Design a protein around this nucleic acid. Sequence first.
RNA 1: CAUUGGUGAGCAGCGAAGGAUUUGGUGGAUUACUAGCUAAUAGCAAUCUAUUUCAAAGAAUUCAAACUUGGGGGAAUGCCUUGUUGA
RNA 2: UGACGGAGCCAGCGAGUCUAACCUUGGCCGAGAGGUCUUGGUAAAAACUCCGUCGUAACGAGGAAUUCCUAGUAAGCGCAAGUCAUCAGCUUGCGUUGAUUACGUCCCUGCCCUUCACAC
Lengths: 282, 45, 94, 410, 125, 121, 99
Amino acid sequence: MLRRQARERREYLYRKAQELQDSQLQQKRQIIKQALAQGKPLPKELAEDESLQKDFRYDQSLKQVDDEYAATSGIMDPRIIVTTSRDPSTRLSQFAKEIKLLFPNAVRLNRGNYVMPNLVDACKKSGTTDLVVLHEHRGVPTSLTISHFPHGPTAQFSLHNVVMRHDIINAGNQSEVNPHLIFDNFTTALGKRVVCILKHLFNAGPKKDSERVITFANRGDFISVRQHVYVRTREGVEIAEVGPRFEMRLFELRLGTLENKDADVEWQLRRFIRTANKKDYL
Amino acid sequence: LREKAKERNPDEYYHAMHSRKTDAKGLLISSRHGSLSMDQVKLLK
Amino acid sequence: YKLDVLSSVHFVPKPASTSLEIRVETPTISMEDAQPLYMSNASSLAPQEIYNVGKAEKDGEIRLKNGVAMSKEELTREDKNRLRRALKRKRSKA
Amino acid sequence: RAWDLIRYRNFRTFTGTERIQFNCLAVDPSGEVVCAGSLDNFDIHVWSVQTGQLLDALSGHEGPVSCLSFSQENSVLASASWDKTIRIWSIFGRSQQVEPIEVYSDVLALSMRPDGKEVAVSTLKGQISIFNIEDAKQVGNIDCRKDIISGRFNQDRFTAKNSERSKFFTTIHYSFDGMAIVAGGNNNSICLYDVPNEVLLKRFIVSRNMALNGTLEFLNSKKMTEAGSLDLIDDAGENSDLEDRIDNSLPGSQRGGDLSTRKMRPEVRVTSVQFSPTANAFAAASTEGLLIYSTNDTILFDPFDLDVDVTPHSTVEALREKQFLNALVMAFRLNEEYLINKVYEAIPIKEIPLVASNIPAIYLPRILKFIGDFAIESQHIEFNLIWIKALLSASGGYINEHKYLFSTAM
Amino acid sequence: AVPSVQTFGKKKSATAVAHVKAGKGLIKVNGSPITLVEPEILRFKVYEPLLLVGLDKFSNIDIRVRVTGGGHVSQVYAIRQAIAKGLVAYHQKYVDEQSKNELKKAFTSYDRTLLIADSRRPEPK
Amino acid sequence: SLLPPTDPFRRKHEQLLLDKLYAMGVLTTKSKISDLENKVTVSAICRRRLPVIMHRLKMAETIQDAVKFIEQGHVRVGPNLINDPAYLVTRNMEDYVTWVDNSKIKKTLLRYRNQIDDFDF
Amino acid sequence: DDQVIGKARSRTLEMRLNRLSRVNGHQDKINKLEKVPMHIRRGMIDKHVKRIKKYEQEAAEGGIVLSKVKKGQFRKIESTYKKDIERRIGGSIKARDKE
RNA sequence: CAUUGGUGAGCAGCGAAGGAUUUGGUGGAUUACUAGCUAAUAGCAAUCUAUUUCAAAGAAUUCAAACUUGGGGGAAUGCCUUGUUGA
RNA sequence: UGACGGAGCCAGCGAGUCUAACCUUGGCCGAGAGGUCUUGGUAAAAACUCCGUCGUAACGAGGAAUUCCUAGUAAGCGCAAGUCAUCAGCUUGCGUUGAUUACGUCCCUGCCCUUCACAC
Ligand SMILES: [Mg+2]
Ligand SMILES: [Mg+2]
Ligand SMILES: [Mg+2]
């Protein structure tokens, strides 16, 4: 297992490095295909490459979700473990339960004295697909990290304006159907990356008449998460909040599990660069 | 260095493993300069 | 074949595929090897495969998989609706 | 693939989602769940026989699953792996529980007791360790490295004694009484151990054929030369027919192809071993074929509870005096088949129920064993059925209380 | 060279290294006699191996144990595991295997943790 | 290649060949079909032989040293000892190449780091 | 293109790719005659030229009208396409064209 | 203080006309023991060969004979096949 | 299931030429800048084991309701770091000691799903 996981990462990393080199080659083949179809002359560099033209005969018969998720996307349902930091307060334990109810296939695990390497290694043995770890400040949720197994990515979020369901009177019990998902205003490549991470925490193929909807709305890199239950009326739709309410702002994305502090950073938030406030990345 | 440590293969074998020795702490021992026989000591004395 | 033999048959199985096979009714003895003994004497097709009660040949008649046949003339009106509704459910499932 | 022997049809075929080779298999005693393991996945796939759907994939092993086995009564699943551990899965029931047991070395084979209360595992160290499933604690251990006979191959540059090619057992099976283990491996020995006393009852040499590679512990030094062993020289070119001379061998193949592909001599090994459900015999799959060892001949004189007064002559005298019960019991104490057969057929029909009700409980397993062997090839169908009817009716309860003592006889 | 063997015992972060060689029944832990191991209430715990197989077996060997890490309890468990493993290994290497089998049978019958490590690996549920 | 480029039969079979060769380890990459011609070589197959993989795993200092250790019965793949230095190791089976348990080489590795436990041996 | 298979596919793709490359690629680099020994190539040219002369004479003595060819270049007879002669002998003798 | 590091100086104990380590050569085994040679129904074994030749039998239109080639492209002159010309 | 004192003794994280007080009383040198000394006040591993001594206005372990929790878990104890968001009115790590009770059931309460052999 340990040896198998090691080589699977080395092969995967090697594949990425080669693909970046092969990206130029792929463009060249696209030019040849366009030239053959259009009939326009081929450029000088490509005109003189006999090796490429010979290869083109074999490579002519050549033709999404992220690679970490492509293998299991839509085949196997996710398995999620929701945990917290050491010695959690009562409110964080309640919030961890709320996050557990949000994802249909989530299981809450007490983090008493568990060390990080054992937690991920134990999760990888059991077939867990994602791990969610929550932090607090005086019983107020502050951060949320999502680590996708076996090799990442790990995305860390900071939670603001959190309103839990336990703060409500006579709210009642949730419905636990597989919910419909709404992802609005995710345009950049990083946004597409974030959407893929969040989309795969939910099961594939909700029923068309499913009455529970979870929405992630991007508004200036602050993703509002709301949960509603709707009823289709004769002249429109009426929705009601189930909660909780909170806004997450991404601030890190690493190519590896959350144990690995040395994992290569895919994206990070630069707060002190001169033009920080000008642009919104997601 | 942390990565070299992580990807170390426990089954790596080098012939020099006979000459080199390790401390109880687990760190490699390197001789300051790299015993004397009684005949050698007698001459030196 | 050569690559499998070279790799000592540690290959990765080919992707699963579906095909259709025709089975001819025959005595089970024939399928066996040739010697002075036999294991089973049954037929190679099950009773369901020989004949399965299906849709009624006559339009007026209604025939169910349990073998119950009803002529529409005899059925009372409440039964006719009940059978009509049961038909809606079965088609909806398929 | 599932096969129906009534109609010889492959009525169902189960396949993994991710194209995994399967090396081991296990079937539910109810015949409703099928589990397979692999040497490249580390999970155990489970299917429903009626539906053919993949129920789930059991996870928890950190190494390839080497073997699987369902218990006949309690219906738990015991799996072992090269992960140096054994896990007991309670797949049936509302709650899913796994009980891992650690072992000193890689587990190669696993056998489940007919009672379902203990499981034995053969490890790479050459040990057969028996564990209690309910308590998950070791109850015994048998050391086997010294018993195993491993021979030197012609191509080996190291002695058989220092060779650690196969000093372990890759397959083990219990006797249905529950008191013995038969073991075999990639070696030239089939060892039969007694579980309660942890002793080797007997060892069997698989082959004495020098055409097989692993047969001899020591090789004749005359064959060795400055070039090397004379056996290793290939003399195909001498053959007169072109087909014989042709070399189709792949350079590195070990298994899975025709003999022409290997280029190395066949090696003596036992791939599987099992006890006969209905007789005191076991079968071992090896290179040459299925060796079947049985006790059928029974030339051995193995008396039970003799005294000076018991004699073959006294047995015949008892029949002449019409003391059939005493004659029958004295025949069993001598334990002679010809004498038991002589007494068995001399008992009149009227007095069979009287004798059957009065046979001591100690000799009940012996009579039932004799009837089962005798009746199968005998012509006295009605006489044997009368005896069985009398024995079951008289001692039906006793056989129930001891199922595993009477299992093969029944 | 004097016949000698080396074994390890582990319990949480506590690690004990036992060196067992031919000698005269001299058993030490961390350079002091085994009788001074603390806490005294758990002292008989580290006596579990010696009393199970008898002091006669130790009369011809010297055992030296060095313990580091963990707390008091885990250190006691590391010591007992290391001593049992060392005795079994020495009997393998320099004495008949029959006596080894008896030693393993005794230790396993009493408490299997003397020989096999007891680590409470997490199991997600 | 001589089949028409959009042929489903052509695309299927070329992928199966690329899948099988990459799994064996003969091919490093699955991206390009021209690799079946340009990058399919005897050196690629020889590079999957047991001595070479031992060398790349650093189990031996040279391929010649690895051959000797194999011929001397120090090497096992899975639970099986292998003394044939032509054994071709697939990518999956490269995880089970390791020393024999009672190997003198294994003791030297553990003795060097002062991690030898004579209970195991 | 979807229907065409076999050698016709391989030769057709090469013919197309050479046509596009001629506009921008340098003359020396784009087309290169396969390396052949002199005594073979000179023999190949002589026999091919003889076939062309026979073809032209037979058409000339008959009434057959033939496509026009530039002075230096060899005429492309049916044997040209089947035997792949041009890859070896070339369209013309460059040494005579240069002078 | 510890060396399970090296090199030495000496005891206790073991201890019959000495003891320990290394190494070359040969012999017997490493499969289950019915004898040597030849032109072999018998001779020879010191060989004959100065009877060792004759006779008889013995020749497929199979008059077929690369099951034996690393892949792609060709093959001027060769080689194979087919037709053709003149003898 | 105390306080005081003494004694014995057991961790794992963590290494940027970088790590860090305030307000005064005065001597001397100095053109100044400032330098040096003097001076008072304010602020700022534990558990565990053994031995000895004493001794049993507000509040004395927290109502009704409500919430969470299944094994290295609940709970106790200390030690570090502060890693572009959050955090010092604190946050996150690390080790140490370590249980009771259930691991069954759909009775109640909610959520959900349904209406190729042989045998049924
Ligand atoms: Mg706590
Ligand atoms: Mg704390
Ligand atoms: Mg906290």
